[PDB]
Amino acid sequence: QADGNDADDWRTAFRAAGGVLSDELKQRHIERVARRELVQEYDNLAVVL
Amino acid sequence: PEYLQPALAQLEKARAAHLENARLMDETVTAIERAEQEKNALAQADGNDADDWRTAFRAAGGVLSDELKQRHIERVARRELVQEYDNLAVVLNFERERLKGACDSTATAYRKAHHHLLSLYAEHELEHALNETCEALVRAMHLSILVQENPLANTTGHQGYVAPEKAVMQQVKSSLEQKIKQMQISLTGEPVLRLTGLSAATLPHMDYEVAGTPAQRKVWQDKIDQQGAELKARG
Amino acid sequence: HLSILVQENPLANTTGHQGYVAPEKAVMQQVKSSLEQKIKQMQISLTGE
Amino acid sequence: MRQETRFKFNAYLSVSKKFTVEPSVTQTLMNTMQESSDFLTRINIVPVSEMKGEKIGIGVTGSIASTTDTAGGTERQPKDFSKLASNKYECDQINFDFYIRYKTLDLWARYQDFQLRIRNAIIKRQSLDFIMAGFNGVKRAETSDRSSNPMLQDVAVGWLQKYRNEAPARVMSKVTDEEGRTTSEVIRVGKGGDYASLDALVMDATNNLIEPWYQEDPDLVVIVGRQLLADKYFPIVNKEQADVIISQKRIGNLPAVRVPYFPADAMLITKLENLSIYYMDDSHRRVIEENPKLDRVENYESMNIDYVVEDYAAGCLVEKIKVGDFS
Amino acid sequence: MRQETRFKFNAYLSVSKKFTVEPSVTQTLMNTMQESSDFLTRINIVPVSEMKGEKIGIGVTGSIASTTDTAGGTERQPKDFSKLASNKYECDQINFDFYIRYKTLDLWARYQDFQLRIRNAIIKRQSLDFIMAGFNGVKRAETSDRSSNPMLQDVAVGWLQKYRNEAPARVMSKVTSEVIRVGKGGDYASLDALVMDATNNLIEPWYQEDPDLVVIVGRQLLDVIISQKRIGNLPAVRVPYFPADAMLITKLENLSIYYMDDSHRRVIEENPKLDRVENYESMNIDYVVEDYAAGCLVEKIKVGDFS
Amino acid sequence: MRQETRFKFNAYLSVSKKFTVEPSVTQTLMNTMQESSDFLTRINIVPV
């Protein structure tokens, strides 16, 4: 749920700033996609448990 | 004025509404244009960086340390991040669609209101200009009828002996229609130069006209609702 | 002329494709009736040299 | 595919406007009732031999042609020949029942040739009743009372209600906006309303709603009531200046017919062979009775019918029409 | 110079409606289909025993008489008789493939007059399709899916495409504004000025004064029904399927379809794997305009009002 | 009140194991199948 909220907020903030971005929306987006990649094994652990 | 004054501010209201709608339209257009022109250059820069990293890695053999590590992960990060960069186009177009619909709606509303005001003014003017002035013509035509009724006036025999009323009416109709045809309209009048003129003067008149008639508007609205309820699954 | 220019608008004709009389003839009949009523109700005085 | 059907198809290998199966009593009565009135002539009254199933298709046309590179590539997937939007009819019974008092019966029987007159009278009273119930009649409810439903609005589901609750997006009931879901509850048609006149209405309606196939058709009719037609053609005659324009009665470049008891505030554009009524083969059960408790001779008759529009994408109807000025 | 044509022509040295090469079966079916509808009666459908040959010239006239100074030294120049532009053509295949489901088959089988109703339905359904593909279609793609092309636009090449493709003249779509206009503020009168300019400027003169010239336009801007009031002194008609925003002036015999004789393959399959019975039919046809004269068309119009 | 049931009932005014509407082929196959097993013998199978 927190990932979804952060994604919505990043998307609307990026839509606000037009099709240009600098010094921000760079670390945030890569952090979000990192979390999206990391939740895979988080969900995977259920089957081994 | 003083009888159509309250029926006038609606023109200004619809004007402001359509102006704001066109402004939002051009803002969306320039936004999508900027986004696309930036995406092109960003993709090209990513490709160049990828080529350079690949050839530099091929130069250093099958071994690498202290470099080609942050660069490669930065490149793959950018490759992952351009996905939503390209994705934003569809949500921007979907947002522009309903905007253009409302634009056509407010345009046709403003046009209807302007036509209604102009019709009311023209009707009042014709009534007030026929009832008050142009009275000497009435007595002139009465004298002409009284003259034509005399039996020693009709040059036509029993056949085609049209009544003098029809004759003088056709005469005045022709002499008036010739004048109304040869003349034209001048804009040297406060109320007619103030707001009147042609239909309208702006960008959106007929180009899109996606809604137009209410039936087509309903079909388009149903399709837009379907598309939006579908897209709500994603971002 | 202004009345004709108004009546030429597409959203003017109350009648459909049947009996769609031309605006010129309509306004001409209107002015003719409103003028003949005046010429019939009036009379000619005699105060003119 | 079935035994008799397989035989008939194999034979196929090696008036055509109405359907008959075998000479029975109910079919004969229905044919008589159809020949009585005129509107029933231009409609399909079909006998069916099942309580529930699939409907047959009449006046359905779908583009069937293509070209495929069978030479080294894909195959040829044939398109369906008769595939409609939704097709599941459910026949149900309705019954008429009346009585004649002894006094009136005697008065009528006094003069000769009374049985034939009675038969023709009841047949005429029945056909118009079929029509009136078909075009009205939102829903069917057992124990139908005729106290507050004088227009016969409770016998069975009608064509209009079929369109309403079976295939929406083919009706027009409100002028809306992206923010105003109801910008206007009623479709105002006048000098200041949402249209210019009925002609433009039926025009853009037949442009937008119905499908492009039936849109270009040599046969289309605009079924409309009597109040609206007269309301349109009255201001034409109420002028001073050609009378043939009252004989053809065309609106929106389409021929117009009028049927009794049609709702005044709606009109339906469609081809006149697209809607139909189905009836069970042998369900016309009729019984007499001569009870003296109220000194009346009564009779009951029951028949199993069901109204059905064949292809919903054929026509469309507009509802809640109001003509005025709206300054 | 084949041994049959010399014998047939030599006997000449010592009726224009139906041709009837030989009474085959495909010809009988084609005659039945053309008799079914009414628009197919006025049109010309003909068979041919080969492909990519010459156009049989039907309904072509001209001026042949002249005078020459035979004594001065010049000689009589025998002007051509059948003078046409791009007399070549071709033929392609088109197939109708459709399945009937078992339940519906039983339903039809219950009542009487089953086979006749089926035959009439299928004949009508394909006859209408011939026309609806005639006035449209701009390609000959190999897939031709009926999903992204609602009207038949990928089956074959149509008359309104042969005109637009072979002779770039005889068609106006730009006055210089891009799309022409019609109205008080446009570039023409309502319709008489435009149709007069068309029938005076593009179509050749010795076809102008013909008692069969017809303007063809769809049901908008107004079997086959004829409007009594002529628009450009020419009777107006409407054909069932037609792009409404365009129109063409030409005769009614100048159009034609050529169906390759002895090419009609009909097979029926019964695959109970699904609950249906399939039927495939394949024929070979090509549309063709007889003469590029006696015909023009206007494409992009928009009636209304302007400044 | 069909014209057959009134005639059949009016004649009454003047055996419970098998029904046998009409000797068709599907009925014969169904009878064979029900005769095959034993549990199908005590049960009731009917056409309509």
CB D267 within 8 A of CB D251: no
Q: How many other C-beta atoms can be found within 10 angstroms of the C-beta atom of residue D213?
A: 19
Distance CA E228, CA E15 (A): 31
Q: How many other C-beta atoms can be found within 10 angstroms of the C-beta atom of residue D323?
A: 20
CB D192 to CB B214 under 8 A?
no
Torsions phi, psi for C15 (to 5 deg)? -75, 145
Distance CA E122, CA A26 (A): 64
CB D68 within 8 A of CB D74: yes
Chain C, 22 to 41: residues with Cβ < 8 Å from chain B are 24, 28, 31-32, 34-36, 38-39
Torsions phi, psi for B9 (to 5 deg)? -65, -25
DSSP string, E15-27: --S---SS--HHH
Distance CA D170, CA D312 (A): 8
- E218-238 CB burial, b ≥16 within 10 A, e <16: bbebeeeeeeeeebbebebbb
Chain F touched by D25 (CB under 8 Å): yes
| Both structure tokens of E250 | 């030409």
CB D80 to CB E99 under 8 A?
yes
Distance CA B84, CA A33 (A): 11
Is D59 buried (19+), middle (13-18) or exposed (0-12) by CB count in 10 A?
A: middle
Chain D touched by B215 (CB under 8 Å): yes
Distance in angstroms between the alpha carbons of the first and the last residue of chain D:
66
Instruction: Give ∠ CA E127-E133-E134 in degrees, rounded to 5.
Output: 90
| Interhelix angle E102-110/E114-134, nearest 10 degrees | 120
Amino acid at B213: T
Distances (CA, A) of B186 to B122, B134, B195, C2, E86: 15, 22, 14, 11, 58
CB B222 within 8 A of CB D169: yes
Distance CA D159, CA D59 (A): 17
CB C42 within 8 A of CB B142: yes
DSSP string, E100-126: EEHHHHHHHHHSSSHHHHHHHHHHHHH
- D60-88 CB burial, b ≥16 within 10 A, e <16: bbbbbbbbbeeeeeeeeebeebbebeebe
Distance CA E179, CA E182 (A): 10
DSSP string, E204-267: -HHHHS-TT-EEEE-SS----EEESS-SSSS-EEE-SS--TT-EEEE-SSSEEEEEEEEEEEEE
3-class SS of residue D286: strand
Q: Can you list the alpha helix ranges (DSSP code H) found in chain A?
A: 2-16, 27-48
- D128-148 CB burial, b ≥16 within 10 A, e <16: bebbbbbbbbeeeeeeeeeee
Q: How many residue pairs from chains D and F have C-beta atoms closer than 8 A?
A: 7
| Both structure tokens of F1 | 């009140």
| Both structure tokens of A34 | 């990192």
Residues 6+ apart with CB under 8 A from E248: E160, E163, E215, E216, E217, E295, E296, E297, E298
Distances (CA, A) of D299 to D30, D127, E199: 19, 18, 74
Residues 6+ apart with CB under 8 A from B168: B141, B144, B145, B148
Which of A19, A30, A33 comes nearest B38 by C-beta?
A19
Looking at residue E303, the DSSP 8-state letter turns out to be B
Distance CA A32, CA B84 (A): 12
Query: Which of B169, B187, B193, B205 should one mutate to test binding to chain C, selecting the residue with the greatest count of C CBs within 10 A?
Result: B169
- Dihedral sign, CA of D135, D139, D144, D147? negative
Instruction: Return the half-sphere exposure (C-beta side, CA atoms, 13 A cut-off) of residue E219.
Output: 18
Closest of E134, E281, E294 to residue E212, by C-alpha:
E294
Classify strands D266-270 and D316-319 as parallel, antiparallel or unpaired.
Answer: antiparallel
Bridge partners of E45, per DSSP, are E257
> Which residue does chain D place closest to F3, by CA atoms?
D285
Residues 6+ apart with CB under 8 A from D233: D246, D249
Chains F and A touch (3+ CB pairs under 8 A): no
Distance CA E28, CA D289 (A): 63
- E59-69 CB burial, b ≥16 within 10 A, e <16: bbeeeeeeeee
Chains D and C touch (3+ CB pairs under 8 A): yes
Separation in Å, CA of E188 to nearest CA in chain D: 25
Distance CA C9, CA C3 (A): 10
PDB experimental method: cryo-EM
Classify strands E92-101 and D79-80 as parallel, antiparallel or unpaired.
Answer: parallel
Residues 6+ apart with CB under 8 A from E219: D216, D253, E238, E242, E244
CB D154 within 8 A of CB D137: yes
Resolution in units of Å: 4.2
DSSP string, D200-223: HHHHHHHHHTS-HHHHS-S--EEE
Q: Can you list the alpha helix ranges (DSSP code H) found in chain D?
A: 3-13, 25-36, 102-110, 115-135, 159-166, 198-208, 212-215, 227-237, 245-248
CB E278 within 8 A of CB E269: yes
Instruction: Return the half-sphere exposure (C-beta side, CA atoms, 13 A cut-off) of residue B122.
Output: 17
Torsion of CA E172, E178, E181, E186, to 10 degrees: -120
Is D308 buried (19+), middle (13-18) or exposed (0-12) by CB count in 10 A?
A: buried
What's CA D163's distance to the chain center, in Å? 11
CB D68 within 8 A of CB E145: no
CB D88 within 8 A of CB D321: no
CB D276 within 8 A of CB D159: no
Rounded CA Rg of chain A: 14
Chain D touched by E274 (CB under 8 Å): no
Bridge partners of D305, per DSSP, are D92, D279
CB C42 to CB B138 under 8 A?
yes
Separation in Å, CA of F5 to nearest CA in chain D: 11
